[PDB]
UniProtKB/Swiss-Prot annotation:
GO terms for cellular component: COPI vesicle coat; cytoplasm; Golgi apparatus; Golgi membrane. This is Putative coatomer subunit alpha. The keyword Membrane applies. GO terms for molecular function: cargo receptor activity; structural molecule activity. Keywords: Cytoplasm, ER-Golgi transport, Golgi apparatus, Membrane, Phosphoprotein, Protein transport, Repeat, Transport, WD repeat.
């Protein structure tokens, strides 16, 4: 495959990137504590947001509301309105670095996870923490809502990937969180976990250099296979929403594309000097973004010799 680069921002180390679902924008969250808002079709910096001290690893748009959420090494989960350009409030409670923060697609919830070994669920309408998910025995490096079921997946330096049943909390919105699976298989800390947008699949990746594919039903889960090849920590991984492909990004300075059905290598993209910290895909478009030591890139993924 080939990478057709649409936009690149040269900056100090970038940690997170988030696509806006309908506007041609990305948010980038940087090691220096700043958040940038770029239009990747014009190549223009629309806004900058300074509300954290130290690196900002969590960043996400709300899918419909004029809001975004950020999570920092200062332990804060900040809620912003990008139209009024205001920091609306800070959600405080985490006791160590915040690694990920996201919005739920239907309920008025924010998910965050932290080196404090917890996952927190907040109600952004009430500004209250409505659940603290405990049980991991080390930092929680990633957490994600399932796109259609009352589930959360989380990845931790305790070498486990947990799937949590949050149906109880959902019914209160209309016991709250119960761990459903403790997926074992990684031999080192796990840095990332992801759901497939439409299939009952999970990806996880970590310091063991492995990307593991799991499948689940309502009653069981199983390890399908492992993508092997990265030669340093894997920082992030995701499913291609529209092709049978897996993508991963690593401190070995590569983004790797793998066949979803065989787990064999499809294409490697390498940078000479930059470790990769994060990758994301637009929900609808053939558009990917990656954060690395020297900034952020937005690119389309094409078959080799397509043009």
């Amino acid at each position: 495959m080939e990478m057709l680069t649409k936009f690149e921002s040269r900056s100090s180390r970038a940690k997170g990137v988030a696509f806006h679902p309908t506007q041609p924008w990305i948010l980038t969250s940087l090691h220096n504590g700043r958040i940038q808002l770029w239009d990747y079709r014009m190549g223009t910096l629309l806004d900058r947001f300074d509300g954290h001290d130290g690196p900002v690893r969590g960043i996400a748009f709300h899918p419909t509301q004029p809001l975004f959420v950020s999570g920092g090494d200062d332990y804060k989960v900040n809620v912003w309105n990008y139209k009024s350009r205001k920091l609306l409030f800070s959600l405080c409670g985490h006791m160590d670095y915040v690694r990920v923060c996201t919005f739920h697609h239907e309920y008025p919830w924010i998910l965050s996870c932290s080196d404090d070994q917890t996952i927190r669920i907040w109600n952004w309408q009430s500004r209250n923490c409505i659940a603290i998910l405990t049980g991991h025995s080390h930092a929680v490096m990633c957490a994600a809502f399932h796109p259609s079921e009352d589930l959360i997946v989380s990845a931790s330096l305790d070498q486990t990937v947990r799937v949590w049943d949050i149906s109880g909390l959902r019914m209160k919105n209309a016991t709250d969180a119960i761990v459903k699976f403790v997926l074992e298989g990684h031999d080192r800390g796990v840095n990332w976990c992801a759901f497939h947008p439409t299939l009952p699949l999970i990806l996880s990746a970590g310091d063991d250099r492995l990307v593991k594919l799991w499948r689940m039903t309502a009653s069981k889960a199983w390890e399908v296979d492992t993508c092997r090849g990265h030669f340093n920590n894997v920082s992030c991984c995701l499913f291609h929403p529209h092709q049978e492909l897996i993508l991963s990004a690593s401190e070995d300075k590569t983004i790797r594309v793998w066949d979803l059905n065989r787990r064999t290598a499809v294409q490697t993209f390498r940078r000479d000097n930059d470790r990769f910290w994060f990758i994301t895909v637009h929900p609808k478009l053939n558009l990917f973004a990656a954060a690395h030591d020297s900034g952020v890139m937005v690119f389309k993924l094409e078959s080799a010799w397509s043009h």
